[PDB]
Amino acid sequence: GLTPQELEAYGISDVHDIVYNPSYDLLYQEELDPSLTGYERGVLTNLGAVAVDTGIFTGRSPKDKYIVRDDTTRDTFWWADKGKGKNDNKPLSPETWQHLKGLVTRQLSGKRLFVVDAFCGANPDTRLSVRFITEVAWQAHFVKNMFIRPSDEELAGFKPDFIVMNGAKCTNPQWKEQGLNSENFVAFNLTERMQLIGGTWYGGEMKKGMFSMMNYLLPLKGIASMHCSANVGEKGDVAVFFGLSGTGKTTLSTDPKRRLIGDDEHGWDDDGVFNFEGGCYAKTIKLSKEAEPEIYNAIRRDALLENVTVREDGTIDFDDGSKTENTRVSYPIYHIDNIVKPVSKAGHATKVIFLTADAFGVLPPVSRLTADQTQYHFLSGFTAKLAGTERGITEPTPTFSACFGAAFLSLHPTQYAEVLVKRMQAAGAQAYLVNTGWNGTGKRISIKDTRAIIDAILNGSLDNAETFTLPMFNLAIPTELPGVDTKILDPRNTYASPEQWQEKAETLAKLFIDNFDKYTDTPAGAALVAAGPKL
Ligand SMILES: Nc1ncnc2c1ncn2[C@@H]1O[C@H](COP(=O)(O)OP(=O)(O)OP(=O)(O)O)[C@@H](O)[C@H]1O
Ligand SMILES: [Cl-]
Ligand SMILES: [Mg+2]
């Protein structure tokens, strides 16, 4: 536990009521207190899970992310202003940090506080011991779900080496004079080992905040830090699935035929692949119980639904994106029946899958990548969206995000590439590119087809298939696969002619080529251009 004096040491004063390590039962009763006002309020759904609204923010706010630039971070951090590529690592002064810390600590002073101690990282040797402090019960619940829950023995010996202070209810009145983006802030200090949050209530800031810290500390010790889901077969064969948001990492790793290691954040050290987290954070927009039975089944007491529409009768309309398209549910990982336990880790990955949702409808559902293509596509980090849907238009809009997670990278993309390649080479890993997005039908590839494709990757069916080369992107693709619609395997088949596919392929190829140009200032980078699409 901790005393009011211990909180005083952090700068938080006059705390009279302290809830240390709140139980799931307490969090349930706290959320449902009928006297709660505003965004703290929870409502009970017919599935038995509590639902909350996360307020004005229903996703992360990268424009409000700052890292204190000091002698510890100056020469290692991938800074937004250093001329080494676009990122969100905006530099913050130590003086401005102290002002933000004053805002948050005063906001939390004189309040009833939840204190949640948890781990980030499955392995004792590299895990962070994180202490989270909040005045909002559902925020405490989110962290209880998403981080690793210590045992009673671990709690007795708990020594934090990172503090996360959530001051969602405060804002920064001096932001203009400080040169910041807004009155909100998500700030990190690697000297004081602390994260401060102001203005946004969104729980993902804590989750991805700690991921950003692991992404800083682990590769500097030779450990890959990866934006991927992961699972393992009965024989100990491990797969990792990289991809940007909405590409299928959580959906596809939750597979009845595999033991789930984790759905979002993993390390890769000398012993194998390990989860940083204690829970999963599923997307619920248009959720289908038939299509995603395990994720659906995880929505029960102790899960926490976010921003969903709950009807008067307590039923949920999963199709309603009126609050946000980013509706979510978090749950502790043991709400999934087939998981790796008691520790979320396994051996070395031998299958590396890059998921992408191609709104341009160009990329094949599945292709086997060469070693050089693996590096090219990892640095590229492509996905796309139909941005114009609400206006009745396509407007395919590309996103290139290095390492399939540039928003969370604390070091240069090439540092993540180097250590991933080292780990893959040692393991004899093979890499694959999977389009979970669109084809010439203007519809997304079915979850059924995609799962069958993943099965074929994992069981060696794809590796043994007759393949040919798709032009332009030069991707090795199969003629047929068990349980997969044969028609979809060649992306040209869903257009009126290959020439109509090619028009779109040329557009997309040019986007890749222009994006990759920034990596060609080194000889290694320049040499990968040949592995990219070619007009
Ligand atoms: N063929 C498909 N494969 C995977 N997901 C699909 C497919 N078709 C539709 N979807 C939908 O796409 C979304 C995939 O979301 P998921 O939560 O798996 O993304 P994620 O990669 O985990 O994102 P994040 O990084 O934000 O956690 C879900 O809404 C899912 O129902
Ligand atoms: Cl992302
Ligand atoms: Mg996910």
DSSP string, 499-535: HHHHHHHHHHHHHHHHHHGGGTTSHHHHHHGGGS---
Task: Tell me, yes or no, whether 247 and 289 share the same domain.
Answer: no
On whether 208 is known to bind a ligand per the annotation, the reply is yes
DSSP letter (8 states) at residue 109: T
Task: Tell me, yes or no, whether 306 and 380 share the same domain.
Answer: no
In the reported structure, the alpha carbon of residue 264 is separated from the centroid of ligand 3 by a whole-number distance in angstroms of: 6
Cβ-proximal residues to 32 (8 Å cutoff; 6+ apart), any chain: 42, 43, 44, 50
Query: Which structure tokens are listed for 248?
Result: 């299928």
From the CA atom positions of the chain, what is the Rg in Å? 23
Query: Which structure tokens are listed for 25?
Result: 């039962």
Beta bridge partners of 225: 267
For residue 272, give the nearest of 119, 423, 125 by alpha carbon: 423
In the reported structure, the alpha carbon of residue 159 is separated from the centroid of ligand 1 by a whole-number distance in angstroms of: 37
Residue located nearest, by CA, to atom 7 of ligand 1: 447
For residue 137, give the nearest of 32, 10, 8 by alpha carbon: 32
Query: In terms of residues, how long is the chain?
Result: 535
DSSP letter (8 states) at residue 339: B
Query: Which structure tokens are listed for 323?
Result: 């609050």
Q: Residue 84 is inside which H or E element, if any? A: none
Task: Tell me, yes or no, whether 179 and 305 share the same domain.
Answer: no
Classified as helix, coil or strand, 403 is helix
* Count of beta carbons in the 10 Å neighbourhood of residue 316: 21
What are 220-225's contacts with CB under 8 Å, separation 24+?
A: 220/76, 220/411, 221/126, 222/269, 222/419, 223/126, 223/267, 223/268, 223/269, 223/419, 224/267, 224/268, 224/269, 224/416, 224/419, 224/420, 224/422, 224/423, 225/265, 225/266, 225/267, 225/416
How many domains does one find in the chain?
3
Q: Which amino acid is at 514?
A: D
Beta bridge partners of 416: none
What are 315-319's contacts with CB under 8 Å, separation 24+?
A: 315/45, 315/46, 316/45, 316/46, 316/47, 316/51, 318/284, 318/285, 318/286, 318/287, 319/285, 319/286
Beta bridge partners of 309: 317
For residue 433, give the nearest of 479, 507, 383, 503 by alpha carbon: 383
For residue 533, give the nearest of 395, 405, 398, 346 by alpha carbon: 398
Query: Which structure tokens are listed for 195?
Result: 């994260």
Beta bridge partners of 185: 198
DSSP string, 192-214: TTEEEEES---THHHHHHHHHHH
Helix (H), strand (E) counts: the chain:
14, 29
Torsion over CA: 172, 176, 180, 182 (sign): positive
What CATH number should be reported for the domain holding residue 470? 3.90.228.20
On whether 330 is known to bind a ligand per the annotation, the reply is no
Task: Tell me, yes or no, whether 507 and 424 share the same domain.
Answer: yes
Task: Tell me, yes or no, whether 456 and 526 share the same domain.
Answer: yes
Task: Tell me, yes or no, whether 1 and 79 share the same domain.
Answer: yes
90 backbone φψ class: left, alpha, beta (φ>0; ψ -120 to 50) = beta
Rounded Cα–Cα distance for residues 478 and 484 (Å): 11
Domain of 304? 38-58+279-336
Reply yes or no on whether 264 is catalytic. yes
Residue 157, Cα to own-chain centre: how many angstroms?
30
Reply yes or no on whether 169 is catalytic. no
Spatial contact of 392 and 502, defined as CB atoms under 8 Å apart: no
On whether 518 is known to bind a ligand per the annotation, the reply is no
Spatial contact of 86 and 63, defined as CB atoms under 8 Å apart: no
Rounded Cα–Cα distance for residues 138 and 503 (Å): 49
Ligand 1 atom closest to residue 283's alpha carbon, by position in its atom list: 17
Looking up tokens 């700030």 gives: 187
Ligand 1 first shell, C-beta below 6 A: 243, 245-252, 264, 281-283, 285, 436, 444-447, 450
3-state SS, 246-263, equals CCCHHHHHCCCCCEEEEC
Beta bridge partners of 433: 354, 367
What are 387-390's contacts with CB under 8 Å, separation 24+?
A: none
Spatial contact of 503 and 535, defined as CB atoms under 8 Å apart: no
Task: Tell me, yes or no, whether 391 and 305 share the same domain.
Answer: no
Spatial contact of 45 and 36, defined as CB atoms under 8 Å apart: no
Q: Which amino acid is at 351?
A: K
Task: Tell me, yes or no, whether 215 and 228 share the same domain.
Answer: no
Task: Tell me, yes or no, whether 135 and 157 share the same domain.
Answer: yes
In the reported structure, the alpha carbon of residue 59 is separated from the centroid of ligand 1 by a whole-number distance in angstroms of: 16
Which string of b and e fits 251-260 if b means at least 16 CB within 10 Å? bbbbbeebbb
Rounded Cα–Cα distance for residues 508 and 398 (Å): 9
Reply yes or no on whether 227 is catalytic. yes
Rounded Cα–Cα distance for residues 329 and 280 (Å): 8
Query: Which structure tokens are listed for 282?
Result: 């599923």
Measured at the CA of 452, the angle between CA 435 and CA 265, to 5 degrees, comes to 60
Task: Tell me, yes or no, whether 180 and 101 share the same domain.
Answer: yes
Reply yes or no on whether 328 is catalytic. yes
Spatial contact of 526 and 520, defined as CB atoms under 8 Å apart: yes
What CATH number should be reported for the domain holding residue 285? 2.170.8.10
Q: Among 222, 237, 257, where does a domain finish?
A: 222
Query: Which structure tokens are listed for 284?
Result: 């619920």
Q: Among 336, 355, 383, where does a domain finish?
A: 336
Spatial contact of 462 and 383, defined as CB atoms under 8 Å apart: no
Reply yes or no on whether 344 is catalytic. no
* Count of beta carbons in the 10 Å neighbourhood of residue 440: 18
Classified as helix, coil or strand, 361 is coil
Spatial contact of 157 and 163, defined as CB atoms under 8 Å apart: no
Residues with CB under 5 A from ligand 2 (ion): 244-245
Rounded Cα–Cα distance for residues 373 and 380 (Å): 10
Rounded Cα–Cα distance for residues 361 and 344 (Å): 36
Classified as helix, coil or strand, 425 is helix
Beta bridge partners of 328: 283, 306
On whether 292 is known to bind a ligand per the annotation, the reply is yes
Query: Which structure tokens are listed for 366?
Result: 């599945």
In the reported structure, the alpha carbon of residue 208 is separated from the centroid of ligand 2 by a whole-number distance in angstroms of: 10
What CATH number should be reported for the domain holding residue 168? 3.40.449.10
Residue located nearest, by CA, to atom 25 of ligand 1: 245
> Which is the catalytic residue, given 69, 141, 207, 249?
249
Spatial contact of 120 and 130, defined as CB atoms under 8 Å apart: yes
Task: Tell me, yes or no, whether 190 and 291 share the same domain.
Answer: no
Omega of the bond prior to 342 within 30 degrees of 0, cis? yes
Task: Tell me, yes or no, whether 426 and 441 share the same domain.
Answer: yes
DSSP string, 138-188: HHHHHHHHHSB---HHHHHT---SEEEEEETT---TTTTTTT-SSS-EEEE
Rounded Cα–Cα distance for residues 410 and 399 (Å): 19
Q: Among 336, 358, 385, where does a domain finish?
A: 336
What are 14-20's contacts with CB under 8 Å, separation 24+?
A: 14/109, 14/110, 15/108, 15/109, 15/110, 15/111, 15/112, 15/113, 16/110, 16/112, 17/112, 17/113, 18/112, 18/113, 18/115, 19/112, 19/113, 19/114, 19/115, 19/140, 20/115, 20/117
Classified as helix, coil or strand, 424 is helix
Phi, psi angle pair for 190, to nearest 5°: -90, -10
